[PDB]
């Protein structure tokens, strides 16, 4: 059984849950983790939903090399200056030096965009809308944490190039909403949509959009997905130019977006919904939504496992994902425990009394509530229960966010509420340095709550729909500049 | 259209087809290639079929790290010695030199098997059947060739551990059959199942089963998929051990297999079926099976007639969708009909569906088969049926053509002179073989590019007459072995 407790040692509870649920195995190279089938299946459920959605938008899947030349890596100065200290460099094969060191992709702008420059020669050659599912490497020497901050991670990155800013601007928001659907409709996690501040925005892009999620267990917020408008900052460096019908002789730079989402998702799903029995899966991504365990003679034993398989096939035929744990090797209760740790939404108990009274027992994982269900009603009732679990999870999580995201209009209120464990929308002047000073003084003036994290606030996002509307001539919390917008600040992952 | 001929310079033809069908772009780093969506789609078709099949076998997908440590990498000494000259090494991040060089996976035995040791505590913990779709790197400095021989490629690698040799041996043949089905039912390419000679087997394994394919245009064979019985060679090194259920205290080492399939498939599909018109897609993997091109839309035609025309194309598109034919309707304004014929012929779309104004007014259409070029006029009401029939018939005939190729280019020979210029005939030869490595090196050296072993076929063309001597003459033949020139 799981014995670590979430409300105490969050990090050890995280370790124990992600290992005992068999989602994650440790590797002998720090910051790289083994994604076992139980986690990978969640990634695939995401993969399937998102791939369908971007296909409806004209995006096509492809695969670009993992290595980058130095010369191409340094064409956009802002971008490479941001990523350079964390780029893994391959320098030899065997004992033989390469001709020239090659970089492993931290992100694939500099891999893809020379190809885009090749493929664009006329207005009719745009848009280009490419996506790939691949790994990238970002070799930070800070302490890694499974799913959340790792040095190799699986992700998808989409890269689109348009002839007009309007097309591009349209796609940035479409994609961001899709990410919000991934979080809220699949992982049952509510998120805040907004723009990044100048400080936090993607180096080399015009503006970045983001969804933020709140982990109430640590009081911290984490960026769940991101979608950037790069504008013409990359096309002018890689010469992605077309020559217009309307505009003779004048080279036109493509307008570009890139957008990304990673297995960080799974980590967030653990931190929000997980409890002290283990993992809790939302039904829409759970590898197995219903697990059938036989409970409690010889003819009776064979007929019992046949009834379990009856339920298995019945559920299979209604697109409920289902496993029959029919091993002679472990108790009923050990299976209860194993599948509770793995977070299966419904446990299906079938014992001979229930088997001959034509019924069964359904145990919900989120609440623990046990129901007796008539055999006849399985396909119906379990579907309903599955549906109700998903809603329940989302509802609980949303009630958390709403109670932890409040407004403060002065620095002192912001400080007190932020040390209270919440994330705060404050009037903000926008300037990078203001954000630095915010970070510095919220760390300096922090009144430490028991077990609370000791760090400064960062900006999370500028919400599209702020809680309040910035009253006219409001100063920023810095006092000295007029506020430009309400910004969501908090302590971050 | 396309200019280079396949029968002349095969390599120039090949580069032209793979770029002009928008499958492959070149990267500024030699040996790595961009799989554009036309190619990636084929890979995803192969993925869907194989993923489903190995799911049925009990294999689950995972993802293991791309980096392996120096210590773990050399634990099985044979395998590491085979791959070391071509392992890429990461030595720094930014400017800071790493404390230890870390390696990029060339294959993943030495990433996964320490975890397998962690996960096999008891006999109940077996079998372990994991597979992953990922990229690997084999930084060889020989001349690359897209799809076939590349420094980085996508593949699947399945790694499985069992408590007995019997279920391991079972799975090896099962996976080899799946690979044969990918080649023959999906890509419409016939292959030859066999075992690698002692020389050509996976280093650190006990035996390697393989499917070999034949590119007739160069006279060369190539290994299309492989499936190894690693035996106990890796479990004795990474200590993957379980206690015998019946003998208390005695530990047993797991028996393991690994099997792999790469994007080389697409390259083979290009070499066997491609022609001087361009790429040729087997309907079963074709991203697009039918393309609907409206013709006749000159400016003289009425807006009434133009909108009726494209509406009729949309009718066809939805009706083929209604029967699970993968149809694109290319209704674009800016490109000409001839430009579209060429575009989609180069990409090798199996059927082109031309609907012009007159055709519409006679409730009929023109279907053009990519492979042979026949134009069939077809009544409107029979679309869904007839198009289905043609798609089937394309796949069949592609396979049939290739198969006859194979059967004429694979012949028996019992002596090395016949072997020698049957081989310089542009063919592959089955010869009686002693199996010894000295003699394999000898056959390579004599046959000069010299000939290499390909496989010891499950089903040889002829049975060995007893006392048959190997072609060395010095020793007696152990088995008919398929030899030839190789990719
Ligand atoms: C504040 O500094 C840190 C503090 N503590 C630890 C680290 C750290 C430690 C490591 F050992 C390795 C790393 C490198 N990995 C990552 O930076 C990272 C970023 C993301 N990100 C970033 C935003 C994004 C979204 N949405 C973008 C789409 C991409 C998304 O998912 C996802 C993952 C799995 N990993 C960082 C860094
Ligand atoms: C006589 O030798 C050579 C001749 N000419 C060129 C090279 C060479 C040149 C390079 F620039 C890079 C490389 C490295 N890549 C590969 O070796 C390779 C092997 C396979 N393989 C090997 C067998 C297999 C099957 N079926 C196994 C499943 C795995 C399968 O698909 C597939 C791919 C795409 N790449 C080799 C080597
Ligand atoms: O790393 C990023 O944030 C962007 C989005 C995906 C690719 N590059
Ligand atoms: O590369 C090979 O040949 C084996 C089988 C696939 C993974 N490793
Ligand atoms: Ca950085
Ligand atoms: Ca206090
Ligand atoms: Ca100022
Ligand atoms: Ca070698
Ligand atoms: Cl525990
Ligand atoms: Cl090199
Ligand atoms: Cl919003
Ligand atoms: Cl639901
Ligand atoms: Cl809660
Ligand atoms: Cl290091
Ligand atoms: Zn300010
Ligand atoms: Zn011999």
UniProtKB/Swiss-Prot annotation, chain B:
GO terms for biological process: cellular response to insulin stimulus; cellular response to type II interferon; glutamyl-tRNA aminoacylation; negative regulation of translation; prolyl-tRNA aminoacylation; regulation of long-chain fatty acid import into cell; tRNA aminoacylation for protein translation. GO terms for cellular component: aminoacyl-tRNA synthetase multienzyme complex; cytoplasm; cytosol; GAIT complex; membrane; plasma membrane; ribonucleoprotein complex. The modification Omega-N-methylarginine is found at residue 138. Residues 1-487 are annotated as: Proline--tRNA ligase. Keywords: Acetylation, Aminoacyl-tRNA synthetase, ATP-binding, Cytoplasm, Disease variant, Leukodystrophy, Ligase, Membrane, Metal-binding, Methylation, Multifunctional enzyme, Neurodegeneration, Nucleotide-binding, Phosphoprotein, Protein biosynthesis, Repeat, RNA-binding, Translation regulation, Zinc. The keyword Heme does not apply. The modification N6-acetyllysine is found at residue 478. It is found in: Cytoplasm, Cytosol; Membrane. Mg(2+) binds at residue 223. ATP binds at residues 138, 140, 149-150, 223, 226, 262, 264. GO terms for molecular function: ATP binding; glutamate-tRNA ligase activity; GTPase binding; identical protein binding; proline-tRNA ligase activity; protein homodimerization activity; RNA stem-loop binding; zinc ion binding. The modification Phosphoserine is found at residue 336. Its main location: cytoplasm. L-proline binds at residues 107-109, 138, 228. The keyword 4Fe-4S does not apply. Changing residue 112 to T: In HLD15; uncertain significance; small decrease in aminoacylation activity. Zn(2+) binds at residues 434, 439, 470, 472. It comes from the Eukaryota. In the N-terminal section; belongs to the class-I aminoacyl-tRNA synthetase family. Glutamate--tRNA ligase type 2 subfamily. Multifunctional protein which primarily functions within the aminoacyl-tRNA synthetase multienzyme complex, also known as multisynthetase complex. Within the complex it catalyzes the attachment of both L-glutamate and L-proline to their cognate tRNAs in a two-step reaction where the amino acid is first activated by ATP to form a covalent intermediate with AMP. Subsequently, the activated amino acid is transferred to the acceptor end of the cognate tRNA to form L-glutamyl-tRNA(Glu) and L-prolyl-tRNA(Pro). The WHEP-TRS domains are involved in RNA binding. Homodimer. Part of the aminoacyl-tRNA synthetase multienzyme complex, also know as multisynthetase complex (MSC), that is composed of the tRNA ligases for Arg (RARS1), Asp (DARS1), Gln (QARS1), Ile (IARS1), Leu (LARS1), Lys (KARS1), Met (MARS1) the bifunctional ligase for Glu and Pro (EPRS1) and the auxiliary subunits AIMP1/p43, AIMP2/p38 and EEF1E1/p18. Forms a linear complex that contains MARS1, EEF1E1, EPRS1 and AIMP2 that is at the core of the multisubunit complex. Interacts with TARS3. Interacts with DUS2L. Component of the GAIT complex which is composed of EPRS1, RPL13A and GAPDH. It is linked to Leukodystrophy, hypomyelinating, 15: An autosomal recessive disorder characterized by hypomyelinating leukodystrophy with thinning of the corpus callosum. Clinical features include motor and cognitive impairment appearing in the first or second decade of life, dystonia, ataxia, spasticity, and dysphagia. Most patients develop severe optic atrophy, and some have hearing loss. This is Bifunctional glutamate/proline--tRNA ligase. It comes from Homo sapiens.
